Amino acid sequence: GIALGMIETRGLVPAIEAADAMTKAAEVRLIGREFVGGGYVTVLVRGETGAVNAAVRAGADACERVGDGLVAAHIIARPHREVEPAL
Amino acid sequence: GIALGMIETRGLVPAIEAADAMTKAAEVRLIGREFVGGGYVTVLVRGETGAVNAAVRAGADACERVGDGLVAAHIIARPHREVEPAL
Amino acid sequence: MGIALGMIETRGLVPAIEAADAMTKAAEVRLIGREFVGGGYVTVLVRGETGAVNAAVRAGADACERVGDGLVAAHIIARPHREVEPALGN
Amino acid sequence: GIALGMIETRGLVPAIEAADAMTKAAEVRLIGREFVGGGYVTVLVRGETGAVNAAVRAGADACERVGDGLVAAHIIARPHREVEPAL
Amino acid sequence: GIALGMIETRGLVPAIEAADAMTKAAEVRLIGREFVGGGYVTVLVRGETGAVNAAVRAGADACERVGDGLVAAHIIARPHREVEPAL
Amino acid sequence: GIALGMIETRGLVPAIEAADAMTKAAEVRLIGREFVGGGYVTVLVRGETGAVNAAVRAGADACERVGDGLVAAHIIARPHREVEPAL
Amino acid sequence: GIALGMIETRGLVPAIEAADAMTKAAEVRLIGREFVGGGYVTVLVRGETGAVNAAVRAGADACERVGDGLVAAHIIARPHREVEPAL
Amino acid sequence: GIALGMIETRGLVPAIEAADAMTKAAEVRLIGREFVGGGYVTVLVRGETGAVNAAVRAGADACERVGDGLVAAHIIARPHREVEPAL
Amino acid sequence: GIALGMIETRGLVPAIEAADAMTKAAEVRLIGREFVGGGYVTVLVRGETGAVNAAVRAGADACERVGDGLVAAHIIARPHREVEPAL
Amino acid sequence: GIALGMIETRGLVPAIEAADAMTKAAEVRLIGREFVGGGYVTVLVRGETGAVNAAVRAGADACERVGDGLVAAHIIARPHREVEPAL
Amino acid sequence: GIALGMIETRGLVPAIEAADAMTKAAEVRLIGREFVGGGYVTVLVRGETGAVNAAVRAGADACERVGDGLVAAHIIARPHREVEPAL
Amino acid sequence: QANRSLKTTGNEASTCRTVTGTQYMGAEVTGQFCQDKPKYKQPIRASVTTT
């Protein structure tokens, strides 16, 4: 799967709890963990469209009340080729 | 020893004393100390389920009086095997 | 050579450097860490004898309480674990 | 498991019945009988944190009515190495 | 049988008379006569559940009016294997 | 005589008083002196029933007036076989 | 160091938690636990003056509300060489 | 100097600090640190009669009201040769 | 088993029904059926404490309602080994 | 221990008895007795900062009421390299 | 002996008459004659502890009536081995 | 020991739910963290009687 699911949060613990929840909800490959800066931490996974959608939804409603909580959670159906150097 | 414990503090030394509370509370293997950026600092340990539970409970109890204090403290019992390569 | 750990954590580097100056002028300490946490949190970490570290960190916290943005944390460490030591510079 | 649970009591009837409670409630290995003197008698068990906590909680809650009752019930999860020669 | 009955008395006189009641009311072998310390004396007997119960009833009833008498009295039905070194 | 007489007191001066009264009142065979602990001292003697009774009553009379005096003292006419190994 | 910190309490729960305070507060080794008698139990620790002071502070703060609680504490700083055989 | 300076107290904390008073007061040599029982502890040192007097002084000043308290302060001036086997 | 149970009935109708109850409610062996004289009849069984109590105590239940009824319901834990068991 | 403690008083009497308080309180070295003038006498000690603190505390506690008494007692925890010639 | 008596006063007229009192009082070895400054003069004498006591008693009891009289008549029984090098 | 407190995450599922088997969670957690007292009291074989 090539669909990309990405989560923003305030600190690594909400990030990794969300990541565990979404990986358990659907088997996706955790592509990256990036320190955005200023407390923003992001997690990047790739997989099938429905699986990644369900995983992102599960991480979203599972990590809302951890620490400061979620910041941004949206889905991309068909990530485009030139985004790979950004991934 | 597989159960992974993890916590932020709004500052480095609250995280350091949190890890001190971790190691003085129960048997834990503090695997990671990470700078989130802007002041948030994460520490992550490994241990048994009840062990890490009691350790982080003690850490949260002993953390709020240190600088800005506790911001986030929740733990997982069964970590996903693919996460640690990213940790 | 005492493994007693002491800290000063400050909002900004000016109180950090003033606190380190007070560390060295107050009691015997060895400075191991000066670290920019990020966003203005600056940490100075010293080691030495328990009473020496206590007096040093106290004098530093008293001196840097106002300077710049002022002190944020003055949390003396009782004793780091053997396992804590690798995470603080090994 | 290095978790250490232990309790003293006035009279050895509560001591041994609480020891049986220790070893029956959770998988914990006993490591000490102590004739403290003056009526205090101490049972000393060793095991992992969760089992130790559950066993000691059950034994303490079942120990008050038996005999002259408890003296103290608290647990240290990570005894230091130097404490072991003073077992 | 492996049924464990046992008594503590304040003073050796109630201890021995309780032991004699133990062995006379029911035919159960005694396994221990231990000095707790400071005046508490414990008697440990082994046998079948019913005989142990009858003997302990008799000993407890006969001990309440000699010297300082009974201090603690209880029965263990199924002692665990490893509490033998704890006896 | 297989009859068992015996007496307990606080302190060893009354205990020696009792033992002297034993050996002087009736020719009853002394068996042992035992330190219960915490000040309780007990003495165990054997003889026939009448001699044991007279000796023990005389010992109580002589011991009541010395030190803390008698604390517990009773006689068994028919001591059981397995009791003797425990004393 | 050779400074002598040392704690008195009733029971071994306070004794060993005081030992834990010793070994978690400052760089201090215990030279020995001791059963004083009548329920009194003490711990004797050796270390630097400030070290033993921090240790005794921790023991006192964690001990007074455990079981019967702390009975005594004292802070010998220069034990004369003639006292070493007594410990 | 052969005279005996010797002190009794409740608990080992006053006994140890009284021994420190002994060894810092005057010329003495401890030859006994005795556990009497029931919390009673004796400290006993040898020296000349003036030295032991001045030592027992110092032992008494910091003991009657430290810890659990002092029981008795005493001076021996002529230790009889028959007493020596007892010491 | 060695425990002796025995039941006594005015008339042997309750004796026989009680003996059948003895051997049906538990597995104990009848050792005696004796005509006391003048109508009293006593039957004695042997077995373990639990089996004897279950049999004897809850055995003459259709006894007070049958015939002239019960006289005495009695259990013995450990009869004297040397003299009476041949009786 | 390079920490410097020092006490000055009126008259040599409190000065040297405070020096003995120094040497018997904690680990210090009496490195100098100095005559300021007009009766002012100073004593110097080196040792650990906690040791120096305890030493000077005990020294003042000895020298309050000695003759005309203390006037000033102070500590320099970490003297610079230009003060050593002051001796 | 090893004990040190030592006495100070305004001027030495009281100090020298007090030294005569030292010598007439008890077997003591005068070792020091120190002009503190501004009028304080101190006498340092060595002898047995009781000898030191008698000496200082006599010196004080003879010093009040001469000149400005006594200021500090101190008594010390054992200075530590590092004090007399400064004496 | 050292166990669950108010500021913990990832261990909320069985907090207010009935429990099968041995108990190890404290009563205060349900008292001041859940809404009702647990309707499950684990019995013991150590009965208390009198002669």
Is the CB of residue B29 less than 8 Å from the CB of residue B45?
yes
Structure tokens at G31: 């030279």
- CA B21/CA E54 separation, integer angstroms: 53
Q: Per-residue b/e over E2-28, b at no fewer than 16 CB within 10 Å?
A: ebbbbbbbbbbbbbbbbbbbbbbbbbb
CA angle E41, E43, E44 (to 5 degrees): 145
Is the CB of residue A73 less than 8 Å from the CB of residue A61?
no
Question: Could you give the C-alpha distances from I80 to I54, I72, I84, in angstroms and in order?
Answer: 22, 21, 6
Residue A87: count of CB within 10 angstroms of its CB: 12
G interface mutation test: which of J20, J22, J23, J27 has the most G CBs within 10 A? J27
Question: Could you give the C-alpha distances from E69 to D39, F84, K67, in angstroms and in order?
Answer: 15, 21, 77
Q: Per-residue b/e over I18-35, b at no fewer than 16 CB within 10 Å?
A: bbebbeebbebeeeeeee
- CA G81/CA K35 separation, integer angstroms: 35
Question: How far does chain H reach from its first CA to its final CA, in angstroms?
Answer: 16
Chain F: residue nearest H36 by CA? F38
Is the CB of residue C8 less than 8 Å from the CB of residue C57?
yes
Is the CB of residue C42 less than 8 Å from the CB of residue C36?
yes
- CA E43/CA E18 separation, integer angstroms: 8
Is the CB of residue H25 less than 8 Å from the CB of residue K78?
yes
- CA G68/CA G74 separation, integer angstroms: 18
Chain A: residue nearest L8 by CA? A66
Q: Which of D38, C67, A21 is nearest to E36 (CA)?
A: D38
Structure tokens at C62: 């008293």
CA-based torsion, I14, I20, I22, I24: positive or negative:
negative
Q: Whose structure tokens read 């800066």? A: A37
Structure tokens at K49: 């502890």
Catalogue the E-assigned strands of chain H.
3-10, 29-37, 40-47, 70-75
* β-bridge partners, C41: C11, C38
CA angle E57, E59, E65 (to 5 degrees): 115
* β-bridge partners, K41: K9, K35
Structure tokens at B43: 């520490």
Q: Which residues in chain E are closer than 8 Å to D43, comparing Cβ atoms? A: 86
- CA H35/CA H12 separation, integer angstroms: 9
Residue K9 is classified by DSSP as: E
Is the CB of residue K76 less than 8 Å from the CB of residue K4?
yes
- CA C12/CA C39 separation, integer angstroms: 8
G11, G24, G30: residue with CB nearest D72: G11
3-state secondary structure of B82: coil
Question: Could you give the C-alpha distances from C26 to C71, G52, G83, in angstroms and in order?
Answer: 17, 22, 35
Using a threshold of 3 CB pairs under 8 A, tell whether chains I and C touch. Answer: no
Residue H62: how many CA atoms within 13 Å on its side-chain side? 18
Experimental method: cryo-EM
Question: How distant is the alpha carbon of residue E63 from its chain centre?
Answer: 11
Q: Which of A15, C16, C58, K30 is nearest to G50 (CA)?
A: C58
Question: E42 Cβ partners below 8 Å, 6+ apart?
Answer: D12, D13, E6, E7, E8, E15, E32, E33, E34, E35, E36
Is the CB of residue B21 less than 8 Å from the CB of residue C83?
no
Q: Which of H4, H87, H86 is nearest to H45 (CA)?
A: H4
The reported resolution of this PDB entry, expressed in Å, is: 4.2
3-state secondary structure of I19: helix
Residue H51 is classified by DSSP as: H
* β-bridge partners, J43: J7, J33
- CA I22/CA I27 separation, integer angstroms: 8
Is the CB of residue I69 less than 8 Å from the CB of residue I35?
no
Structure tokens at A36: 């955005």
Structure tokens at L12: 């909320």
Q: Which residues in chain J are closer than 8 Å to C55, comparing Cβ atoms? A: 49, 77
Is the CB of residue C71 less than 8 Å from the CB of residue C26?
no
Q: Which of H80, A21, E37, D55 is nearest to B79 (CA)?
A: A21
Contact D36 G11 (CB under 8 A): yes
- CA C61/CA C72 separation, integer angstroms: 9
Question: I20 Cβ partners below 8 Å, 6+ apart?
Answer: none
Residue A26: how many CA atoms within 13 Å on its side-chain side? 19
Structure tokens at E2: 């492996």
Give the strand pairing for C30-38 and G70-74: unpaired
K73: left (phi over 0), alpha (psi -120 to 50) or beta: beta
3-state secondary structure of F71: strand
DSSP assignment of A13-37: HHHHHHHHHHHHHS--EEEEEEEEE
Question: Could you give the C-alpha distances from K40 to J40, J68, J69, K57, K65, in angstroms and in order?
Answer: 9, 11, 13, 20, 17
Residue G84 is classified by DSSP as: G
L33-37: long-range pairs with CB below 8 Å, 24+: L33/L6
- CA A54/CA A67 separation, integer angstroms: 23
Q: Which of E51, E59, E53, E47 is nearest to E3 (CA)?
A: E47
Residue K32: count of CB within 10 angstroms of its CB: 14
* β-bridge partners, F40: F10, F37
Is the CB of residue K44 less than 8 Å from the CB of residue K34?
yes
Please state at what angle helix G49-63 crosses helix G12-25, rounded to 10 degrees.
Answer: 140
B interface mutation test: which of D49, D53, D56, D84 has the most B CBs within 10 A? D49
Is the CB of residue I6 less than 8 Å from the CB of residue I42?
yes
Reported residue count of chain G is: 87
Q: Which residues in chain D are closer than 8 Å to E86, comparing Cβ atoms? A: 16, 19, 30, 33, 43
Q: Which of L17, L11, E80, E77 is nearest to D25 (CA)?
A: E80
B27, B50, B53: residue with CB nearest D78: B27
Please state at what angle helix E12-25 crosses helix E49-63, rounded to 10 degrees.
Answer: 140
Q: H83 burial class (0-12, 13-18, 19+ CB within 10 angstroms)?
A: exposed
Chain B: residue nearest D77 by CA? B26
Residue type, A53: N
J23, J25, J50: residue with CB nearest G50: J50
J11, J19, J23: residue with CB nearest K36: J11
- CA D63/CA D25 separation, integer angstroms: 13
- CA E76/CA I31 separation, integer angstroms: 32
Q: Which residues in chain E are closer than 8 Å to D30, comparing Cβ atoms? A: 82-83, 85-86
Question: How far does chain D reach from its first CA to its final CA, in angstroms?
Answer: 15
DSSP assignment of K21-87: HHHHHSSEEEEEEEEEETTEEEEEEEE-HHHHHHHHHHHHHHHTTSTT-EEEEEEES---TTTGGG-
D interface mutation test: which of E40, E68, E75, E78 has the most D CBs within 10 A? E40
- CA B65/CA B85 separation, integer angstroms: 34
Q: What are phi and psi of D12, to 5 degrees?
A: -90, -15
Element (H, E) at F41: strand F40-47
Is the CB of residue B3 less than 8 Å from the CB of residue B48?
yes
Is the CB of residue J6 less than 8 Å from the CB of residue J42?
yes
Question: How far does chain J reach from its first CA to its final CA, in angstroms?
Answer: 17
- CA A35/CA A19 separation, integer angstroms: 15
- CA K35/CA K23 separation, integer angstroms: 20
Is the CB of residue K64 less than 8 Å from the CB of residue K21?
no
Residue type, B12: L
Is L41 near chain E, with CB under 8 Å?
no
Is the CB of residue D49 less than 8 Å from the CB of residue B50?
yes
Sheet order of strands, A3-10 included: A29-37, A40-47, A3-10, A70-76
Question: Could you give the C-alpha distances from H86 to D72, H34, H79, H83, J44, in angstroms and in order?
Answer: 39, 12, 11, 5, 47
3-state secondary structure of I27: coil
CA-based torsion, A64, A67, A71, A72: positive or negative:
negative
Is the CB of residue G40 less than 8 Å from the CB of residue H39?
yes
* β-bridge partners, I45: I5, I30
Residue type, H1: G
Q: Which of B52, B57, B53, B69 is nearest to B13 (CA)?
A: B69
Give the strand pairing for H3-10 and H70-75: antiparallel
Question: How distant is the alpha carbon of residue B14 from its chain centre?
Answer: 11
Residue G39: count of CB within 10 angstroms of its CB: 23
The chain J residues in contact with chain K (CB within 8 A) are 10-14, 16-17, 19-20, 23-24, 29-30, 32-33, 35-41, 66-68
Q: Which of I78, I57, I82, I60 is nearest to I16 (CA)?
A: I60
Residue A25: count of CB within 10 angstroms of its CB: 16
Is the CB of residue K7 less than 8 Å from the CB of residue K53?
no
Q: What is the nearest CA distance from J50 to chain C, expressed in angstroms?
A: 5
- CA B41/CA B31 separation, integer angstroms: 14
- CA C15/CA C10 separation, integer angstroms: 6
L2, L3, L8: residue with CB nearest B73: L8
Residue type, H49: T
* β-bridge partners, K47: K3, K28
- CA G34/CA B45 separation, integer angstroms: 36
Question: E21 Cβ partners below 8 Å, 6+ apart?
Answer: E55, E58, E59, E62, E63
Residue I79 is classified by DSSP as: -
* β-bridge partners, G47: G3, G28
Is the CB of residue J76 less than 8 Å from the CB of residue C59?
no
- CA J22/CA J31 separation, integer angstroms: 11
- CA D25/CA E80 separation, integer angstroms: 11
Residue A66: how many CA atoms within 13 Å on its side-chain side? 31
Is the CB of residue I6 less than 8 Å from the CB of residue I57?
no
Structure tokens at G22: 């010793």
- CA F73/CA F60 separation, integer angstroms: 8
- CA E75/CA E4 separation, integer angstroms: 6
Is the CB of residue H26 less than 8 Å from the CB of residue H47?
yes
- CA F18/CA F66 separation, integer angstroms: 10
- CA G6/CA G27 separation, integer angstroms: 14
Structure tokens at L10: 């990832």
Q: What are phi and psi of B76, to 5 degrees?
A: -115, 150
Is the CB of residue J69 less than 8 Å from the CB of residue J63?
yes
Contact E20 F80 (CB under 8 A): yes
Q: Whose structure tokens read 């150097």? A: A85
Using a threshold of 3 CB pairs under 8 A, tell whether chains I and G touch. Answer: no
- CA C65/CA C75 separation, integer angstroms: 14
